[PDB]
Amino acid sequence: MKEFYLTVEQIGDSIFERYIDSNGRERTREVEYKPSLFAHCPESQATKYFDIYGKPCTRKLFANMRDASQWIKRMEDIGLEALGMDDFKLAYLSDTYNYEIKYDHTKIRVANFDIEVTSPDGFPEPSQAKHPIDAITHYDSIDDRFYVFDLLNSPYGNVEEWSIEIAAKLQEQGGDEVPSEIIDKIIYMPFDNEKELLMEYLNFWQQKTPVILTGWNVESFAIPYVYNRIKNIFGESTAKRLSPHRKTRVKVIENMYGSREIITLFGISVLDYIDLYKKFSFTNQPSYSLDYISEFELNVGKLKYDGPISKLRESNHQRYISYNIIAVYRVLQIDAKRQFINLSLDMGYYAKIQIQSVFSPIKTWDAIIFNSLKEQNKVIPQGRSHPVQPYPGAFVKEPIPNRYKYVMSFDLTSLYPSIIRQVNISPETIAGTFKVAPLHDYINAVAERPSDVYSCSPNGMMYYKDRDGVVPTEITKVFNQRKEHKGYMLAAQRNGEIIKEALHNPNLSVDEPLDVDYRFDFSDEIKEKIKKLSAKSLNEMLFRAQRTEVAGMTAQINRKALINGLAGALGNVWFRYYDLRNATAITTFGQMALQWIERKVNEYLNEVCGTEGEAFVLYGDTDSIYVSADKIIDKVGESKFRDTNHWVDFLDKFARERMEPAIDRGFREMCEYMNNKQHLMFMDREAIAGPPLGSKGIGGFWTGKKRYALNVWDMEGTRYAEPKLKIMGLETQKSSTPKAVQKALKECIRRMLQEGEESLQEYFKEFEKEFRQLNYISIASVSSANNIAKYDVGGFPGPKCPFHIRGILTYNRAIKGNIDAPQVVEGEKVYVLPLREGNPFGDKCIAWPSGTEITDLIKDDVLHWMDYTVLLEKTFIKPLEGFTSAAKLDYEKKASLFDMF
DNA sequence: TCATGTAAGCAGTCCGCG
DNA sequence: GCGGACTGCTTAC
Ligand SMILES: Nc1nc2c(ncn2[C@H]2C[C@H](O)[C@@H](COP(=O)(O)OP(=O)(O)OP(=O)(O)O)O2)c(=O)[nH]1
Ligand SMILES: [Ca+2]
Ligand SMILES: [Ca+2]
Ligand SMILES: [Ca+2]
Ligand SMILES: [Ca+2]
Ligand SMILES: [Ca+2]
């Protein structure tokens, strides 16, 4: 097999590399890598190295990496550019793996671990590590085993061995319900003392050294705790055995309002799953406890136990250990679904970076572009300092707040990457500038043509047309990858809808789910077999189709994120290729493209309708337009349609056969106007929206920019079994809105769009009457909590104290004296409830850690004093009033003359 | 919240507005 | 009471 790296590090003048050799074995080597850097050289002299602008360079070979680093410093002292890859390990990887890396995941040791630490005096701080580690569960992907290290004797209690037999049993048998599929994979090791446990753990670690190390909060908690606890008991040298090269560093992670410490383990790639989840999931959650995320992702119930976690080991060690094991498994289950580890490996090996660098689009693109240029013996420029400067972004149209009955939307494919490719925007393709007219002059096609030679953006920039820049070339590669996975995702989505339809008429039989590939549209034969299947088999197929869709989503959306990240990186001062001219060329071209096509669509539809100056485009944001289809429907007449699906088909055909060709003609003209390199402005129909045929539903509404709701029947070619609400920006979509309130507002919207005013009024009246019965957590607001200390003046709110911070200060007074009480953590999320006048907490609100029950000390008082009236007005009535006023609808029945009967 | 960008919405504080 | 200046937070893209 072809070799591939696992990890790479620079330690002084050595590269330390862990890798898989040609025989599939893991090896480690120390290489005295001699790096090269570059300086500009006279034009008259012969060389094969040129910078990105075609200026000749001489290569400088250094005796060692420290000499190279020192040379860069002296070049700064002199005032001359020191060119080349200054991150020598990237250069090492580029030299050692000068081909497209083919990796075998089965040879990569991925470790998932979690520790337990009993602490009687509050949260066990990793930097102090003053309490015994009393459990570690460490899953190894190569062995496919859960290694359980269990401390039986502690200063906080002596316990009996954990029983695998009890662990396996149902909760209803007094067991822990450790999933049957992992029972045979547990290797259980009890220990008489903590020193023995840790020494054995380190020996185990040496034998099975993680390449990828993951788990939940492992970077911020488990790793620093283990490192510091071992350091405290045995000394530094023993703790450094967590690094295969015996090198570690305390790394200070700084943010806007403070800093924290993590432990860098040289020769390991730490991908904390909480961080993978935050980057790759495209969710914003009210809580990031593993319980919460597991329930959200997997529909598993929270791990239930009596009493505080600080007493769980002594009261129920059996459950304590079982829950440690289950916690490790839940992360594996989330990854089986989301496939973020797979994604990280794909991206990392593609870029030729340390796998943990996938968190940085700047590092990722630096490596991709470096490798690409190196292939042509080209030399990358030195990174430079730049002041942070604001620059303009997208255009968003101000919508007229209203109901909108029939709507068809259209969207540009991968806009910013397409602009980069179309215009040929790259550091080395800048050709010059032209005299800019106001943007509206380009939009209306009255400005002078910018150039007859170069490819242009309306910010004034011109680009070469003779050859693609490295940015367009490399962005295209990832774009094409993204397109493939999006194809699989959408096929899985369409396949899911076939199954949903079939589930209306399930067969009374005993059968099995069909063995199919959900990434491809079901054949006619498969469709016929589906129509004969039982509900059990159909539901299993639906689950599998949906899992295939999620895998496709992960692969596609994050490749999209990577390419959009390149467009953003051009506007980040730390990017080697930072250039506000290029960053702004992209965004300004986007503004023109949207407004140009708004004009063209309005012109086209006014022609087919025989009107003048009518606005068909009701809204647009960045790359999408929303077109009122009322007049199109009315031209044939609603009574001509057999059912909802009939007019959806009609609009689908109208969009594809009439509007898209007109849109394409419009963009081809714009391409010619800007003299662009290649026409890549591809705007296709996105959504078809409207009320059910014959209903009193309003179809859709807008309240303002980035705030709307549509009842959608077809989305990018997926024809839904049941209409789907597309709601953007409204409170139903915000993590800050209480859970039960999101649900209620969504039903209000559903009724508005599908059923009408009377249905909405019926529901509102019921919710208002019953909502006080809702669980307090379900009606709590949510907020991130920053700068708690800043607004804390002697335990009370300082000037301009935010509402949620005031709530935290209230909580802090209520629990004062308790070392045991859950503390609110700076930067994390809290639940927030308003409090009635004259409550014993002495303020108008209270807040506590999100994803948790409020401590029993004050729970009863919170429940008694919760201000339901304020809660309802703020979270429910105010947003609903906004939706209904926009839609010209009443949520309460107005008096009429009939009331006199 | 260490980790690519800008546009723009709403909650809430402070306080003017005769 | 509501709107502007401002902070804080959160989405849409
Ligand atoms: N710099 C930067 N731009 C972004 C980011 N997210 C969205 N944008 C900009 C660039 C996108 O091309 C543009 C439109 O985004 P969309 O979500 O509508 O999707 P896009 O057209 O990129 O892809 P798609 O429609 O799914 O093919 O908005 C981002 O994270 N960074
Ligand atoms: Ca735990
Ligand atoms: Ca798009
Ligand atoms: Ca599309
Ligand atoms: Ca059937
Ligand atoms: Ca869009």
CSV table of N, CA, C and O and ligand atoms in Angstrom, one decimal, chain A residues 502-507 529-534 538, ligand 5:
chain,number,residue,atom,x,y,z
A,502,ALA,N,-45.2,5.6,0.9
A,502,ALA,CA,-45.5,4.1,1.0
A,502,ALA,C,-46.1,3.8,2.4
A,502,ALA,O,-46.9,2.9,2.5
A,503,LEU,N,-45.6,4.5,3.4
A,503,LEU,CA,-46.1,4.3,4.8
A,503,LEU,C,-47.5,4.6,5.0
A,503,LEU,O,-48.1,4.3,6.0
A,504,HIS,N,-48.2,5.3,4.0
A,504,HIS,CA,-49.6,5.5,4.1
A,504,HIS,C,-50.4,4.2,4.0
A,504,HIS,O,-51.5,4.1,4.5
A,505,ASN,N,-49.8,3.3,3.2
A,505,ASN,CA,-50.5,2.0,3.0
A,505,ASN,C,-49.6,0.8,3.2
A,505,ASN,O,-49.2,0.1,2.3
A,506,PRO,N,-49.2,0.6,4.5
A,506,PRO,CA,-48.3,-0.5,4.8
A,506,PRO,C,-49.0,-1.9,4.7
A,506,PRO,O,-50.2,-2.0,4.9
A,507,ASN,N,-48.2,-2.9,4.4
A,507,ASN,CA,-48.7,-4.2,4.2
A,507,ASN,C,-48.7,-5.1,5.5
A,507,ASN,O,-47.7,-5.0,6.2
A,529,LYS,N,-41.3,-2.9,-5.0
A,529,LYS,CA,-41.1,-3.8,-3.8
A,529,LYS,C,-41.4,-3.0,-2.5
A,529,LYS,O,-42.0,-3.6,-1.6
A,530,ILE,N,-41.1,-1.7,-2.4
A,530,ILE,CA,-41.4,-0.9,-1.3
A,530,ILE,C,-43.0,-0.8,-1.1
A,530,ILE,O,-43.4,-0.9,0.1
A,531,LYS,N,-43.7,-0.7,-2.1
A,531,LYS,CA,-45.2,-0.7,-2.1
A,531,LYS,C,-45.8,-2.0,-1.5
A,531,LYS,O,-47.0,-2.0,-1.2
A,532,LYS,N,-45.0,-3.0,-1.3
A,532,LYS,CA,-45.5,-4.3,-0.8
A,532,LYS,C,-45.0,-4.6,0.6
A,532,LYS,O,-45.3,-5.6,1.2
A,533,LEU,N,-44.2,-3.7,1.2
A,533,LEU,CA,-43.5,-3.9,2.5
A,533,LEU,C,-44.4,-3.5,3.7
A,533,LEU,O,-45.3,-2.7,3.6
A,534,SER,N,-44.1,-4.2,4.8
A,534,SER,CA,-44.7,-3.9,6.1
A,534,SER,C,-44.2,-2.5,6.7
A,534,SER,O,-43.2,-2.0,6.2
A,538,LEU,N,-40.6,-0.7,6.4
A,538,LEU,CA,-40.6,0.6,5.8
A,538,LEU,C,-40.0,1.6,6.8
A,538,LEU,O,-39.2,2.5,6.3
D,5,CA,CA,-48.3,-1.1,0.5
